[PDB]
Design a protein around this nucleic acid. Sequence first.
RNA 1: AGCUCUUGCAUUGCUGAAUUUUUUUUUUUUUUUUUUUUUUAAAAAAAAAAAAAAUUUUUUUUUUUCAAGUCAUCAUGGGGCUUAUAGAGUGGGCUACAGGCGUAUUACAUUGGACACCCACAAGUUGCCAAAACUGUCCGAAUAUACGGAUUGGAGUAAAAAAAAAAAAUUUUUUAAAAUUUUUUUUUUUUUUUGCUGAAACUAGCCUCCAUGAAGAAGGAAUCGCGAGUAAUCGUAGAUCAUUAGCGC
RNA 2: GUGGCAACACUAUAAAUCAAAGCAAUUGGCAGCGAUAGAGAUGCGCGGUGGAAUAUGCUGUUUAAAUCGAAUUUACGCGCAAAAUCUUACCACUUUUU
Length: 97
Amino acid sequence: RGNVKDHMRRMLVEQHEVDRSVFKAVTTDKSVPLEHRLQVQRLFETEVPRDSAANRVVNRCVLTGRARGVHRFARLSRIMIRQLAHSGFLPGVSKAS
RNA sequence: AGCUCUUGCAUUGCUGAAUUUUUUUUUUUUUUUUUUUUUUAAAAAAAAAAAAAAUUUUUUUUUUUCAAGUCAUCAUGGGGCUUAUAGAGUGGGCUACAGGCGUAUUACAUUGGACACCCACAAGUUGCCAAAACUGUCCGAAUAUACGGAUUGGAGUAAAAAAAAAAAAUUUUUUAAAAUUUUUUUUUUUUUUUGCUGAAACUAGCCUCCAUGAAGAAGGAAUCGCGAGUAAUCGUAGAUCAUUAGCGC
RNA sequence: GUGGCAACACUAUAAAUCAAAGCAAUUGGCAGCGAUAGAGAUGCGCGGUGGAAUAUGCUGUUUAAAUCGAAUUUACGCGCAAAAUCUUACCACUUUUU
């Protein structure tokens, strides 16, 4: 399915690098500025791409277009993990016990 | 070229079910004797005897049938679509709520609740951490109990540690007593504390603390599951995950 | 036609159709036919459900959409090992390219 559209979202997290967003987040998590955090947070999460915060990423699979049931254990999805596992074309993951 | 459009009765793949049990009876090594093939030699073959035994924390693994399920896993046959069955953007909805059903959890207490304890011993030191309980103490009036913890409002708050100087022998009762030899000033100072995480938590997260405290006093007909470290009970840690699993796995 | 008191007892062919009707040993499905083995297979126990509330899934109702499949056993803590936007395919609106 649409694995690449998420890669575009990941690229927007990094083209408009998260550092710029998080540094503005630093000044809104500081209570030292008495106010203007409302002004800083008023824009700067709206001029900043709303599709670049780190929650819109949904961590899809890479083999296929799986969007549900993924694994970071070996960057694959369950049915493929089983297919590669029985094939053994994977780093030594055997049937258990 | 693209479909998340159809067709699982066109399909590959993968799985469901119970067919719940069978997966040890079989070889190999050695000995003795002997014979089959090749211009100084190995295997081979045959009669008998003895031993080695059969993978993993103990389940996986081997299994027959349902046009069983899935075209939204991808794939792909056929058909359909291409100003829309194609892509974006913003916000919903995928979680709504007479009824009814399935699966779980929590109780309806005293074999218990609470609170403390030592903060009891684990799976789990490989390139330290619990709970039930044991010991102590409070509670047993149909109280709906100090059981239970559903719904609903409301609010997001305390400190503890100790250092240096000046002074020093002060605070509190009755009509006779009491606490300090540290009282009152300045400078200090840590460690926690901040509601959390996210851009945004009303619906619709979660946390903490108040308050309101529901049913429920063990459940018919009916029925399911399981005979040893098993049921039940008790935590624990892993996944996906910004956080959300309390009950799911 | 013969016998009888008869029920009828004989003797006795065909017309007409069909392409098999049959037979014996089996090999399988039945048992409302027995002997031997095995399963909490029961009657033997424990704990559940169904009673209450919450969670959670499904139908049904409505809504603009409540996206779509799973459908008796083996569907209903199922695809979802997680939906606040995104995931998301559904709707309202505004655009885009063939």
